[PDB]
Each structure stands twice: as C-alpha cells, then as structure tokens.
Amino acid sequence: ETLNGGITDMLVELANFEKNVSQAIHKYNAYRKAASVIAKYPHKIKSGAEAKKLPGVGTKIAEKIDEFLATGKLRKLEKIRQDDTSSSINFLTRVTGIGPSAARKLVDEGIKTLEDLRKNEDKLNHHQRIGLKYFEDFEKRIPREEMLQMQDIVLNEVKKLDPEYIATVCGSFRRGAESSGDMDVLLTHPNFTSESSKQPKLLHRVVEQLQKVRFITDTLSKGETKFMGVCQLPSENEYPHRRIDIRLIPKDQYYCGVLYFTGSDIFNKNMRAHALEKGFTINEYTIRPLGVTGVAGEPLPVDSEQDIFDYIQWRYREPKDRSE
DNA sequence: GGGCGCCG
DNA sequence: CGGCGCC
Ligand SMILES: Nc1ccn([C@H]2CC[C@@H](COP(=O)(O)OP(=O)(O)OP(=O)(O)O)O2)c(=O)n1
Ligand SMILES: [Mg+2]
C-alpha cells in the first residue's frame, strides 16, 4: 500500500543528514516539506517529473527522485551508509541532550561510539552525562499500563499536598497511543495566572515531594514553569527510568495548555500556522488577534479547545485524531 | 510555530 | 547575552 512511500522515506533521510550532517536547515526544511506533499498526493508517482509538477518539490529534489525511481538508491544517499564521520554523528544524536553541535565536536575529538562516550565522559555536560548514563532505557517506550500507573502515582501526592492541583498527562496519552515516549504532564492550581505571577514553587513542590517519595530520580531542569526529568517505577527486585516532564500554567490559560501539550508537533504548527494566516498567533498561553500592523492582541476568551479551532475557523479535532 | 531553561 | 537542545 501507501504508494509514494519509498520515495518519501528516501526523502526524509536526506533531510536529516542535511539537518544533521550539515546545518543545511533550509535544505532539510524543504526536504521534509517535500516529503510531506508527496505523501498527501494520490497517484503512482512514476515520472519523477510528474512530481516536479507538484509544488514545493523542486528540480534537485526532483532529480533524487528518478535516481531512486530507476534503481533503489542514491549514492549520495549511500554515502551515509558509507562515510564514517556522518554515520557517526547520527548516533550521538540518538543521545538525549546531545544535539548536533556538541555532537560534531564530539566526533571532532574522535569520540565516536557509545563506548567512546563513556571513556572520557569528562567532556560532557551533566544533561548529557545523564543521557549516557541512561541511554539504553530511553530506547524502550513506555507501555500504556505503566503510564496509567505512573499517572496515578502522580495524582496522589499531587493532590495530597494541595487538593487544588490539576494534573493531566498529555501528549501521546491524550492521543490514545498504545505506547508513549514519556510522561508529558500538565499542571495547574486556582490562584496562579497572568495576574498572580510568581508561585513557581508549586511546581517545585510536587517534584519536591516526588523526589522525596522516590519517584523522580533525576533532574534535567528545574525552571520556574517547567521540569524535565527522570523517574521510574518502584520495584520488587526492575523497570526503566522514564523521561518525564511537567509543566505548570496560569490556570486562566489552561486551554492552550492542553492544546500544546497535546497537539502532535506538526498539529500545533499547522494550527499555529493557519492562525497567523487567519489574524492570530497562538501560544501555549493564549491566542490573540494579529492587529494587522503586527501587534498580538489582548487575549482571547477560551472556555474550551473548541473556542480555539473555532476562532481559527477550524473544525475541532478530538485528540486521538490529532496526529497530523 | 512558539517559548523555557542550560551554559559557556 | 546569544546559541543550544528540548518541549
Ligand atoms: N516543538 C514542540 C514540541 C512538543 N510540542 C508539544 C506537543 C506535545 C508535547 C511533546 O510531547 P512528546 O512527548 O515529544 O510527544 P509525544 O507525542 O508525547 O511523544 P512521546 O511518545 O515521546 O510522549 O509538546 C509542541 O507543540 N512543539
Ligand atoms: Mg539528541
């Protein structure tokens, strides 16, 4: 099935390499986009030119296409499976924390294995230190069952501190993903707003106790409106440490709150995208009119997600659908 | 597409 | 402070 696949597949690879292997954001942007548009198309893309017809995709993209069309490969593409350097780079990116810049440097010092990484860890930054530490786990996804469990675990101590703490795990969860990547938890409490501005400690508390109780083990960031971290389940003799994150909002904006944290990357963007077009710019905070002159306006009334899409003249989508 | 928190 | 890597 799904016809224009191979090609798309092929397409993206390119992008990341250009993304990663080079900065070439621009090429990567295009590439990605190009991958997209090709997939949304409904016919067997025979002639790579046919494709060319198709908007966005251009001449060189166009080229890579037929190469593939003739024979299942692009040497450029093969180079990756060939050139050490780059193959190396990709790995590192597999590491949480280590993004390309740092990744390069790491190779630039011949650091080019997981093992290597260990060997002179000394060069890493903590965040990275932790990644390496945990590496293995991070590959394995979190199964819904646990996710549920975890969820609870949270809910408890949360409310225990103060009843008035809204907790809501979102992201993949809201999208009914049989397996999710990490705990994406939203948070709120009745006094906090655009007009209270402070109290971040509330955030600080949950974790505080979360840490105390023996949940979050590790701490990647303890910012005032956000927290990234690691945790893991309790045992009887073991399970993987899971990434975790919590974010707290000014209750008054709760709605963008669910929106963003849920969304699905692309999803949010589309919207956010559509929005600008429609005279607004959304945020995980608010939606405001783009007062033509440029100016983001005074926050829009948001009693539910609905309002948003509505505002945007877009049909509401219910979470599990959200994927695009 | 938008913004948060690390750090050098 | 960019500039990173993540969300
Ligand atoms: N640049 C970004 C990154 C994330 N998001 C939002 C959407 C959901 C959340 C990111 O959650 P992830 O955990 O990355 O996504 P997920 O779908 O929850 O994936 P996972 O299976 O890893 O939890 O933040 C966003 O709008 N823009
Ligand atoms: Mg990485």
Side-chain angles (χ1 to χ4, degrees), chain A residues 1-13:
Chain A
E1 288 167 47
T2 189
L3 46 278
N4 304 144
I7 171 156
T8 10
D9 289 20
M10 176 277 260
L11 260 56
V12 67
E13 294 201 358

PDB file of all heavy atoms in Angstrom, chain A residues 1-13:
ATOM      1  N   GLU A   1       0.813  -1.217   0.000  1.00  0.00           N
ATOM      2  CA  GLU A   1       0.000   0.000   0.000  1.00  0.00           C
ATOM      3  C   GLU A   1       0.863   1.291   0.000  1.00  0.00           C
ATOM      4  O   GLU A   1       2.038   1.318  -0.420  1.00  0.00           O
ATOM      5  CB  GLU A   1      -1.212   0.001   1.038  1.00  0.00           C
ATOM      6  CG  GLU A   1      -2.450  -0.931   0.696  1.00  0.00           C
ATOM      7  CD  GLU A   1      -3.523  -1.236   1.757  1.00  0.00           C
ATOM      8  OE1 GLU A   1      -3.968  -0.175   2.412  1.00  0.00           O
ATOM      9  OE2 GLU A   1      -4.020  -2.349   1.902  1.00  0.00           O
ATOM     10  N   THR A   2       0.218   2.370   0.475  1.00  0.00           N
ATOM     11  CA  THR A   2       0.756   3.733   0.616  1.00  0.00           C
ATOM     12  C   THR A   2       1.833   4.200  -0.428  1.00  0.00           C
ATOM     13  O   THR A   2       2.819   4.842  -0.069  1.00  0.00           O
ATOM     14  CB  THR A   2       1.030   4.057   2.128  1.00  0.00           C
ATOM     15  OG1 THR A   2       1.364   5.411   2.406  1.00  0.00           O
ATOM     16  CG2 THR A   2       1.993   3.060   2.785  1.00  0.00           C
ATOM     17  N   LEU A   3       1.624   3.877  -1.728  1.00  0.00           N
ATOM     18  CA  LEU A   3       2.467   4.170  -2.916  1.00  0.00           C
ATOM     19  C   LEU A   3       3.791   4.954  -2.871  1.00  0.00           C
ATOM     20  O   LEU A   3       4.897   4.399  -3.026  1.00  0.00           O
ATOM     21  CB  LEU A   3       1.692   4.632  -4.172  1.00  0.00           C
ATOM     22  CG  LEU A   3       0.603   5.710  -4.008  1.00  0.00           C
ATOM     23  CD1 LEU A   3      -0.688   5.092  -3.534  1.00  0.00           C
ATOM     24  CD2 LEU A   3       0.957   6.844  -3.068  1.00  0.00           C
ATOM     25  N   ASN A   4       3.645   6.258  -2.708  1.00  0.00           N
ATOM     26  CA  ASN A   4       4.696   7.241  -2.656  1.00  0.00           C
ATOM     27  C   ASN A   4       5.522   7.149  -1.397  1.00  0.00           C
ATOM     28  O   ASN A   4       6.019   8.143  -0.880  1.00  0.00           O
ATOM     29  CB  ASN A   4       4.012   8.614  -2.718  1.00  0.00           C
ATOM     30  CG  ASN A   4       3.140   8.705  -3.942  1.00  0.00           C
ATOM     31  OD1 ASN A   4       2.063   9.323  -3.926  1.00  0.00           O
ATOM     32  ND2 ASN A   4       3.600   8.013  -4.981  1.00  0.00           N
ATOM     33  N   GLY A   5       5.671   5.954  -0.889  1.00  0.00           N
ATOM     34  CA  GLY A   5       6.420   5.779   0.337  1.00  0.00           C
ATOM     35  C   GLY A   5       7.928   5.815   0.267  1.00  0.00           C
ATOM     36  O   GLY A   5       8.540   6.698   0.891  1.00  0.00           O
ATOM     37  N   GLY A   6       8.470   4.838  -0.477  1.00  0.00           N
ATOM     38  CA  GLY A   6       9.890   4.646  -0.680  1.00  0.00           C
ATOM     39  C   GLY A   6      10.532   5.974  -0.886  1.00  0.00           C
ATOM     40  O   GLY A   6      11.498   6.357  -0.244  1.00  0.00           O
ATOM     41  N   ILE A   7       9.913   6.662  -1.792  1.00  0.00           N
ATOM     42  CA  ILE A   7      10.347   7.953  -2.143  1.00  0.00           C
ATOM     43  C   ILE A   7      10.372   8.921  -0.987  1.00  0.00           C
ATOM     44  O   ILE A   7      11.351   9.659  -0.807  1.00  0.00           O
ATOM     45  CB  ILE A   7       9.483   8.449  -3.236  1.00  0.00           C
ATOM     46  CG1 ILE A   7       9.831   9.883  -3.425  1.00  0.00           C
ATOM     47  CG2 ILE A   7       8.017   8.301  -2.861  1.00  0.00           C
ATOM     48  CD1 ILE A   7       9.452  10.271  -4.829  1.00  0.00           C
ATOM     49  N   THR A   8       9.285   8.922  -0.205  1.00  0.00           N
ATOM     50  CA  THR A   8       9.237   9.810   0.929  1.00  0.00           C
ATOM     51  C   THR A   8      10.330   9.462   1.878  1.00  0.00           C
ATOM     52  O   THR A   8      11.070  10.342   2.328  1.00  0.00           O
ATOM     53  CB  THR A   8       7.944   9.693   1.705  1.00  0.00           C
ATOM     54  OG1 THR A   8       7.242   8.574   1.234  1.00  0.00           O
ATOM     55  CG2 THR A   8       7.166  10.990   1.611  1.00  0.00           C
ATOM     56  N   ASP A   9      10.382   8.153   2.157  1.00  0.00           N
ATOM     57  CA  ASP A   9      11.355   7.582   3.058  1.00  0.00           C
ATOM     58  C   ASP A   9      12.701   8.131   2.714  1.00  0.00           C
ATOM     59  O   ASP A   9      13.367   8.774   3.527  1.00  0.00           O
ATOM     60  CB  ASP A   9      11.413   6.061   2.919  1.00  0.00           C
ATOM     61  CG  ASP A   9      10.217   5.373   3.461  1.00  0.00           C
ATOM     62  OD1 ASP A   9       9.187   6.178   3.572  1.00  0.00           O
ATOM     63  OD2 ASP A   9      10.215   4.195   3.754  1.00  0.00           O
ATOM     64  N   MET A  10      13.042   7.866   1.462  1.00  0.00           N
ATOM     65  CA  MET A  10      14.279   8.290   0.875  1.00  0.00           C
ATOM     66  C   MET A  10      14.401   9.782   1.147  1.00  0.00           C
ATOM     67  O   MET A  10      15.391  10.268   1.670  1.00  0.00           O
ATOM     68  CB  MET A  10      14.264   7.908  -0.623  1.00  0.00           C
ATOM     69  CG  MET A  10      15.465   8.371  -1.411  1.00  0.00           C
ATOM     70  SD  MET A  10      15.327  10.088  -1.970  1.00  0.00           S
ATOM     71  CE  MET A  10      14.804   9.989  -3.710  1.00  0.00           C
ATOM     72  N   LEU A  11      13.354  10.511   0.830  1.00  0.00           N
ATOM     73  CA  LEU A  11      13.379  11.935   1.049  1.00  0.00           C
ATOM     74  C   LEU A  11      13.806  12.453   2.394  1.00  0.00           C
ATOM     75  O   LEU A  11      14.695  13.298   2.537  1.00  0.00           O
ATOM     76  CB  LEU A  11      12.058  12.594   0.709  1.00  0.00           C
ATOM     77  CG  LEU A  11      12.199  13.196  -0.646  1.00  0.00           C
ATOM     78  CD1 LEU A  11      12.620  12.067  -1.569  1.00  0.00           C
ATOM     79  CD2 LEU A  11      10.877  13.821  -1.058  1.00  0.00           C
ATOM     80  N   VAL A  12      13.151  11.960   3.404  1.00  0.00           N
ATOM     81  CA  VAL A  12      13.486  12.434   4.702  1.00  0.00           C
ATOM     82  C   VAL A  12      14.936  12.272   5.137  1.00  0.00           C
ATOM     83  O   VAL A  12      15.517  13.253   5.623  1.00  0.00           O
ATOM     84  CB  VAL A  12      12.494  11.928   5.687  1.00  0.00           C
ATOM     85  CG1 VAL A  12      12.688  10.428   5.737  1.00  0.00           C
ATOM     86  CG2 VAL A  12      12.730  12.612   7.034  1.00  0.00           C
ATOM     87  N   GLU A  13      15.467  11.037   4.935  1.00  0.00           N
ATOM     88  CA  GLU A  13      16.822  10.644   5.274  1.00  0.00           C
ATOM     89  C   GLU A  13      17.725  11.767   4.897  1.00  0.00           C
ATOM     90  O   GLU A  13      18.566  12.234   5.650  1.00  0.00           O
ATOM     91  CB  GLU A  13      17.235   9.317   4.586  1.00  0.00           C
ATOM     92  CG  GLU A  13      16.412   8.110   5.102  1.00  0.00           C
ATOM     93  CD  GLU A  13      16.993   6.724   4.916  1.00  0.00           C
ATOM     94  OE1 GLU A  13      18.148   6.721   4.290  1.00  0.00           O
ATOM     95  OE2 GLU A  13      16.450   5.713   5.342  1.00  0.00           O
TER      96      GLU A  13
END
